[PDB]
Design a protein around this ligand. Structure first.
Ligand SMILES: O=C(O)[C@H]1CCCCN1
Lengths: 112, 113
């Protein structure tokens, strides 16, 4: 469903269901012909500011819910998220095509 | 209930029925009742690019569009006031649509395949 790659190990606490996480992130459409399978960037907190959400309660795609609760504060990770754990067959109009596997760089900076 | 349609240009072409592919031009806003026409931040628009083509009425888009668009005629422009229940519900697209966001869409039905 979601495959994680740790590019920086974190050692703080690991978010649990219902906690508000603070993350920096960049989202990419998956393109296996590209380095690290990163195709077009569709979204990013960078510049916008750190993104906050309660995790594990389906306020974001399942791939984030599942990926981010497996992280530890301080961890930088890449989440490879299959379409059905992302925006599935519907996609998101204007942003993400139907059935798009997704690649996210996620930086877990804290828990509220 | 969840979706109220204000027709802003009457259309006279055919009307979609469930499962037909529709071709629409749209602009999406977060609803903001302290703004004119209830239109808060614009998060998306197909104006100036390709139309959005989709089967209508089969939950491939938010229910507000499934109900709203099938009540339209080709050529019709309409403002769709969509509650969270008929929009993306309790999920959000980060940076664009918070969870449980009411939505306003300007929709323009330009064809049925
Ligand atoms: O833009 C926002 O506020 C976020 C909240 C968490 C879910 C996604 N949308």
């Amino acid at each position: 469903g979601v495959t994680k790659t740790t590019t920086q190990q974190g050692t703080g606490p690991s978010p649990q269901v219902g906690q508000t996480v603070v993350i920096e992130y960049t989202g990419f459409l998956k393109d296996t012909s590209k380095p690290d399978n990163k195709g077009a960037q569709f979204d990013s907190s960078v510049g916008r500011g750190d993104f906050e959400t309660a995790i594990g309660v389906q306020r974001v795609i399942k791939g984030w819910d599942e990926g981010v609760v497996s992280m530890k504060v301080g961890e930088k990770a890449t989440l490879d998220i299959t379409a059905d754990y992302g925006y599935g067959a519907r996609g998101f109009p204007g942003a993400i095509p139907p059935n798009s596997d997704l690649i996210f760089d996620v930086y877990l900076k804290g828990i509220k």
